[PDB]
Amino acid sequence: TFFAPDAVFGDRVRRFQEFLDTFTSYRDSVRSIQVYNSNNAANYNDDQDILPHRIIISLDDLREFDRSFWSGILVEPAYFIPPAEKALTDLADSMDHPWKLSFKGSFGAHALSPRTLTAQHLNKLVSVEGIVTKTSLVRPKLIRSVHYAAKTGRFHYRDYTDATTTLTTRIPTPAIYPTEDTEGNKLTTEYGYSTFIDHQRITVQEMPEMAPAGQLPRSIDVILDDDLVDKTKPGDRVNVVGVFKSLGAGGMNQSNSNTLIGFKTLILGNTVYPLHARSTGVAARQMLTDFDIRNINKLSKKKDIFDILSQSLAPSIYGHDHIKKAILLMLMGGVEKNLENGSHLRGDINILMVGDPSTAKSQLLRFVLNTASLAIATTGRGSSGVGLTAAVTTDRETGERRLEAGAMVLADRGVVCIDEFDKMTDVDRVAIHEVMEQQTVTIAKAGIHTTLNARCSVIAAANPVFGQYDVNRDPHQNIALPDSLLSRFDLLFVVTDDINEIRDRSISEHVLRTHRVTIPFLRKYVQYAKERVIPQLTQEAINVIVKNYTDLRNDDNTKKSPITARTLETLIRLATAHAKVRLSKTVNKVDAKVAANLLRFALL
Amino acid sequence: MSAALPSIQLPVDYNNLFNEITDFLVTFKQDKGPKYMAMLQKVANRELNSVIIDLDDILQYQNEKFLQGTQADDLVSAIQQNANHFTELFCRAIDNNMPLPTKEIDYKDDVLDVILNQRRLRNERMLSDRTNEIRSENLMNDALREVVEDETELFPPNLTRRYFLYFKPLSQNCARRYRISSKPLSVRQIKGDFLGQLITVRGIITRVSDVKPAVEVIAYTCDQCGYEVFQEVNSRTFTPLSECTSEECSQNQTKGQLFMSTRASKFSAFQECKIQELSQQVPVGHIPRSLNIHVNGTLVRSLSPGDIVDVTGIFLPAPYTGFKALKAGLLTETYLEAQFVRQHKKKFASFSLTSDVEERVMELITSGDVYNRLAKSIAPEIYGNLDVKKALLLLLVGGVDKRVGDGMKIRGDINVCLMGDPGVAKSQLLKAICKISPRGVYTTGKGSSGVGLTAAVMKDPVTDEMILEGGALVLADNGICCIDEFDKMDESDRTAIHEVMEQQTISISKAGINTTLNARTSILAAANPLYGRYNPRLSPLDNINLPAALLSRFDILFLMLDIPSRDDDEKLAEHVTYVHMHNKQPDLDFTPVEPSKMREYIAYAKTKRPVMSEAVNDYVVQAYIRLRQDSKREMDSKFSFGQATPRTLLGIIRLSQALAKLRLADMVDIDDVEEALRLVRVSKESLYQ
DNA sequence: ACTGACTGACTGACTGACTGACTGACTGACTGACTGACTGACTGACTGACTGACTGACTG
DNA sequence: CAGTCAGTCAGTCAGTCAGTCAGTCAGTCAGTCAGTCAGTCAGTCAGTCAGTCAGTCAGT
Numbered sequence A: 001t002f003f004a005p006d007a008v009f010g011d012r013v014r015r016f017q018e019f020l021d022t023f024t025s026y027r028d029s030v031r032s033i034q035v036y037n038s039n040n041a042a043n044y045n046d047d048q049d050i051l052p053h054r055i056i057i058s059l060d061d062l063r064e065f066d067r068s069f070w071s072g073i074l075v076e077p078a079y080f081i082p083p084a085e086k087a088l089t090d091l092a093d094s095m096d097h098p099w100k101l102s103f104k105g106s107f108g109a110h111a112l113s114p115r116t117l118t119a120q121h122l123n124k125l126v127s128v129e130g131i132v133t134k135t136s137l138v139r140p141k142l143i144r145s146v147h148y149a150a151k152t153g154r155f156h157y158r159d160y161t162d163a164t165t166t167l168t169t170r171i172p173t174p175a176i177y178p179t180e181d182t183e184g185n186k187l188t189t190e191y192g193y194s195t196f197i198d199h200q201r202i203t204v205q206e207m208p209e210m211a212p213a214g215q216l217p218r219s220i221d222v223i224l225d226d227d228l229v230d231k232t233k234p235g236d237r238v239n240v241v242g243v244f245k246s247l248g249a250g251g252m253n254q255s256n257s258n259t260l261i262g263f264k265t266l267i268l269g270n271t272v273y274p275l276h277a278r279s280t281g282v283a284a285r286q287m288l289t290d291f292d293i294r295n296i297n298k299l300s301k302k303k304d305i306f307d308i309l310s311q312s313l314a315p316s317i318y319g320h321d322h323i324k325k326a327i328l329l330m331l332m333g334g335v336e337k338n339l340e341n342g343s344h345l346r347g348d349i350n351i352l353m354v355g356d357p358s359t360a361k362s363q364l365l366r367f368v369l370n371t372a373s374l375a376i377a378t379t380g381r382g383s384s385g386v387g388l389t390a391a392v393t394t395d396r397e398t399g400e401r402r403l404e405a406g407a408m409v410l411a412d413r414g415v416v417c418i419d420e421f422d423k424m425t426d427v428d429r430v431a432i433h434e435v436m437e438q439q440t441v442t443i444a445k446a447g448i449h450t451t452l453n454a455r456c457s458v459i460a461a462a463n464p465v466f467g468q469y470d471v472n473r474d475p476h477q478n479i480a481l482p483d484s485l486l487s488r489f490d491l492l493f494v495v496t497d498d499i500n501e502i503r504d505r506s507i508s509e510h511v512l513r514t515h516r517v518t519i520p521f522l523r524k525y526v527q528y529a530k531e532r533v534i535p536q537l538t539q540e541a542i543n544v545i546v547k548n549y550t551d552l553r554n555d556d557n558t559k560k561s562p563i564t565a566r567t568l569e570t571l572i573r574l575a576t577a578h579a580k581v582r583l584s585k586t587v588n589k590v591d592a593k594v595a596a597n598l599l600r601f602a603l604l
Numbered sequence B: 001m002s003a004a005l006p007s008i009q010l011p012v013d014y015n016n017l018f019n020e021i022t023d024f025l026v027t028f029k030q031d032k033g034p035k036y037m038a039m040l041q042k043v044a045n046r047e048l049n050s051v052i053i054d055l056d057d058i059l060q061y062q063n064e065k066f067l068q069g070t071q072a073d074d075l076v077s078a079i080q081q082n083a084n085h086f087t088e089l090f091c092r093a094i095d096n097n098m099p100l101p102t103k104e105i106d107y108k109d110d111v112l113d114v115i116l117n118q119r120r121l122r123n124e125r126m127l128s129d130r131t132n133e134i135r136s137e138n139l140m141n142d143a144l145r146e147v148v149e150d151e152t153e154l155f156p157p158n159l160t161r162r163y164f165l166y167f168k169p170l171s172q173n174c175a176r177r178y179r180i181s182s183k184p185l186s187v188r189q190i191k192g193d194f195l196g197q198l199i200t201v202r203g204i205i206t207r208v209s210d211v212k213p214a215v216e217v218i219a220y221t222c223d224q225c226g227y228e229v230f231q232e233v234n235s236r237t238f239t240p241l242s243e244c245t246s247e248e249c250s251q252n253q254t255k256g257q258l259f260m261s262t263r264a265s266k267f268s269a270f271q272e273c274k275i276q277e278l279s280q281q282v283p284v285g286h287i288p289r290s291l292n293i294h295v296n297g298t299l300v301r302s303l304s305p306g307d308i309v310d311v312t313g314i315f316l317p318a319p320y321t322g323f324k325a326l327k328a329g330l331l332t333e334t335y336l337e338a339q340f341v342r343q344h345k346k347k348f349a350s351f352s353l354t355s356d357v358e359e360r361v362m363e364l365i366t367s368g369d370v371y372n373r374l375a376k377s378i379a380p381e382i383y384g385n386l387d388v389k390k391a392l393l394l395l396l397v398g399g400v401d402k403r404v405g406d407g408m409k410i411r412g413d414i415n416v417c418l419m420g421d422p423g424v425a426k427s428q429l430l431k432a433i434c435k436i437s438p439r440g441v442y443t444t445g446k447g448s449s450g451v452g453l454t455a456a457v458m459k460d461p462v463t464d465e466m467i468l469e470g471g472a473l474v475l476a477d478n479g480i481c482c483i484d485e486f487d488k489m490d491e492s493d494r495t496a497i498h499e500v501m502e503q504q505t506i507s508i509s510k511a512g513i514n515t516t517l518n519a520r521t522s523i524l525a526a527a528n529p530l531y532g533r534y535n536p537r538l539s540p541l542d543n544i545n546l547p548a549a550l551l552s553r554f555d556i557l558f559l560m561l562d563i564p565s566r567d568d569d570e571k572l573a574e575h576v577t578y579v580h581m582h583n584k585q586p587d588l589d590f591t592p593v594e595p596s597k598m599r600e601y602i603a604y605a606k607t608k609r610p611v612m613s614e615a616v617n618d619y620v621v622q623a624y625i626r627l628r629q630d631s632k633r634e635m636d637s638k639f640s641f642g643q644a645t646p647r648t649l650l651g652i653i654r655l656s657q658a659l660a661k662l663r664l665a666d667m668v669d670i671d672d673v674e675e676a677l678r679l680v681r682v683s684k685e686s687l688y689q
Numbered sequence C: 001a002c003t004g005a006c007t008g009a010c011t012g013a014c015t016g017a018c019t020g021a022c023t024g025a026c027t028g029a030c031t032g033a034c035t036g037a038c039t040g041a042c043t044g045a046c047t048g049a050c051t052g053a054c055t056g057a058c059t060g
Numbered sequence D: 001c002a003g004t005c006a007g008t009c010a011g012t013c014a015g016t017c018a019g020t021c022a023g024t025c026a027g028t029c030a031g032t033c034a035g036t037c038a039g040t041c042a043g044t045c046a047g048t049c050a051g052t053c054a055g056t057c058a059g060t
């Protein structure tokens, strides 16, 4: 007997036992965790000769099970969480350790931002969201010691506790780190058998998209635990569900007190979820039921789907099919081939638009900013620290210099949507030269010489030099950002403003009826097209791009400028991407025809 | 005692493991006689300081004993689980048996030897005096030994040691042959549940500090009683002590007073550094972390900054927490002890052996036509430009410096520019040759500041104080410093580079520095022409944004044209598409040399120092009369480049001396200097088409 | 030879001075605590130097 | 009439030093606390006397 607990604790354990045996999915989840760790242990104990312990409980069911247990948890959680955890360890031990819970909700009008937190909400269960800054370092915490004795040869043992334990209180008893037992003998300690459990604390500010007009922000701080270390990098957007504990003696202990108001507050646990934002953080968690992949397989084998998905990104924009084809070929992105003992070769596609004003060149990039995943938009400026980190760190614990990522490091595997590309000064264009082929960013400022990684994809939309004169004088510097910047870009779409009468009609009823295939299927098509499967190139497609490339040199070197081997490499990239679209494995002549036609319309 | 600080039993025994470790220490025959009597006799003969106890001989001993009968107690996993107790247990297993007298002491040997000799001899005479006293007071002889051995205070055997002891982890090869202790981990992977084991990391060393002595035991004298009161120090800070703690100045009225001395303590070198994450093993959106390393003993001075290393050591705690208001008890803040250091990219010229090496080198020598094969081998995955690869092999060889007794020094080194734009694949060569050569640093245009690639001054944590933290150029000396986009550099950086063009020198007169640091580097540059590209209407140096003085400091200058031509395009297309189709280019009939064996060849080649002769004097002189003669009859700003400075003469003797080393001959001949004049006249003057 | 008269010895009740426990003020002592600031690194605003972009004005 | 060169402001970067905040400390002084003691009070035990009974002697 610990303290031979009361029949109240028996009442809570029996009732929650009845609920957990009422709905029977959770038993199957426990069975899945237990079998998976079992067979992993069989692989690690049989050939050569991980998953945590928590069950996600939703608060849907308890509202239709018991009002008492429902409104019991959301008011006083230090009386209702340790019984339910005790019964769940009873079930998991009986079917074949902590076994914590989650409480995914649906929360009870406790959806509050940390502006309105304190203080009559104290010691309840509260859900908080916001930005994460300024995440500290990971340190291990000690729980159990083990000592070897000399010379009698008996191990020993000791426990340790704290105030950030299970959620009740306890009359504290400190305990010296032992040495020289009775009778007097040296106790040489040991490691490897003495346990350790990790520990980390992060602080949370309220959202800037939700904040007031201009005021100072106000923030709280969260302690994490064993299986929650290192989920959220600083800069994310994070939902936290926990218990708003208030520990410490607030200066009422000793008289003539300083630290005028004590009772410092924090949040324990419990279930940090990262969530999707508009501009930072992955959204690849989107579900794929078997109905959905069965429908993808149903539409997967047609012969017009490139012309269906061409006209899918334009629900309300007239014309410009070939731009849409280029944007889908960007979102598929090609394949990445890293060599053995050399340098890798680049996979994606880079697109520049240029043309007259009022041509929906800025309306398009917001649409690519919505449908894709990890889009980051930079307009104008810029300096300092888009392509770099600027290294401004003043770490308080010790003299050390960290890095704070800009816009180029953070958008990895993503899309960067730059507007007004001519307004950039050349000093940042040095950094764009460093990104767009070298695929690395070397920073050796004060400092620490590093070489991190960033392999983004770039879309820009620049204005002409003077007027709308896109065809009048010559193509030779209507753009005027020479010359390597013209060569790094794959495609150069040149958009004009022709005047007609039929074009005025077709624009007219489109714009008029707009004031009065579907995309959340289309991105589920996209990610399944991306992870499976990479194609290989075959013999049927070499000679088309070889003959086509010698054609483009021997004649387009008589028409226009410039042509490098980078054109050949982008031919291979668009061939691979159009092979990815049809969910195939090999490469056909059809792909070389389509990419050939796109490069014809792009250049000529 | 029960009921407070209780007990636990575990399967681990420390009884038969000591006996088995004795049996392993004596009887191991595999590598004249046994293995450890030879090395341990070599230790007691005072010509050696460390002992490498691997983890392969133990495992082979367990399979041997497992097949002989009887069953052998599992010991390798017992080392891998705990790995801290076994240095002391193993080392007091060594000390029972040692082949002592094998050589008399030299007079001029050392001071640590003679101190440990007097401690040993005094210990013997003290132990014999008491049995010369009690034995004459009577009243098999094991009992009298047990009497004398417990009424006499002695120097404990923790202090008369003279050596150190280092483990060594097991390969994948030995674990593959018979079927973990060394899986190469990353710094993100080290969970807080490995504290005590024996692990292996990899990363780039940054900020390695100085070597300064740290104390282990401190030796006082008592001046009245005559004792020597020791004291061990485990912590960071210690405190001195007072009157006495002997058995004679205690239990008396008049205690003495003690004060320390430094020729009787025991010191140990000490040096700490940091491992940063390798930046290839990172997730998609993260930043490299770090993790400290202490280094004790013989292993010091083997951690050069800016490398790629495989440190294997054990992983302990060391008590601290940060601000006082953030502590929850009993947060611990880990580090990594070092045991054995293995580098990738092994550094010349830290090698001596030749016998086994010729089994690989003489295959390349007996392969026939070594030179054009190696010229093919550097970055094979591009097409064309055999002459550029041809010159850059001569960059990697280099040599040979010369002191003329004044002493003014000459170089000794080659400096190469690259010109032309954009699709001649010049960045691939810079990443390539700044990956073959050890100690090679690749910095872009902007990029580093002026203070980034010169040194700066910053305060140093724990070891003190005020060390000059190096920049890019001080990091990569006796190496190759690749540079991208040379035109966009700030003008202060230009004068820094011009100061590197004169040898050894960067001079600083900023706010806290008056120094003249050293740099023996080699510079490869890559400048772009004026926009857009290559107008033969435009003159040379019109399309170049650099003065001809800087053109004169480069002894070898190139230019890579870009002219559309019908015949090469099919070979280029079949080349590139042949690798996107596969992952290896060459065929019919050639294999690429692996880069490790190539670095063994070039690392072998730099120990020759060839010597010129008298016929090459005539030929070099007359060729210089040719170049000097026709170079100054034009005098124009045309496609000609005036005026063929004598830096070309020193550079062409230096290229001859570089080509002579790859024959490995000290046989400077006419094919040498003829080859050099070929690379000079073909080097430039490619802008005719 | 027995019985009453007297007598010492024992035995029970009375008398009081000792004996053992109990618990309120007085003061040294002894330890918190805070006042005595002191120290020391670190952080945050001030200020000049420099290098880049803009524009007049000069020249082909 | 258009390119260019040089002058010129502007933004940004590195050096500068005065506040600032956290950690330690010794002396003293005061606040309480415990050991001192003294007076109270009931219990208890040894001295002392009176009564009563058995022994013994003398009278009839």
Ligand SMILES: Nc1ncnc2c1ncn2[C@@H]1O[C@H](COP(=O)(O)OP(=O)(O)O)[C@@H](O)[C@H]1O
Pocket (backbone or CB within 6 Å): A316, A317, A318, A319, A356, A357, A358, A359, A360, A361, A362, A363, A364, A511
């Ligand atoms: N082809 C088109 N179809 C429909 N709307 C168009 C079309 N072209 C331009 N627009 C209109 O032009 C506006 C966007 O202007 P835009 O060209 O994107 O800005 P900017 O040229 O300044 O970048 C949108 O409001 C859109 O209604």
Ligand SMILES: Nc1ncnc2c1ncn2[C@@H]1O[C@H](COP(=O)(O)OP(=O)(O)O)[C@@H](O)[C@H]1O
Pocket (backbone or CB within 6 Å): A437, A438, A565, A566, A569, B381, B382, B383, B384, B422, B423, B424, B425, B426, B427, B428, B576
């Ligand atoms: N002969 C060649 N063989 C293979 N690839 C080539 C060749 N010539 C050009 N290329 C391609 O041209 C590109 C040149 O770009 P890079 O060398 O990175 O910088 P820069 O454009 O400054 O030379 C390379 O990516 C390479 O793929």
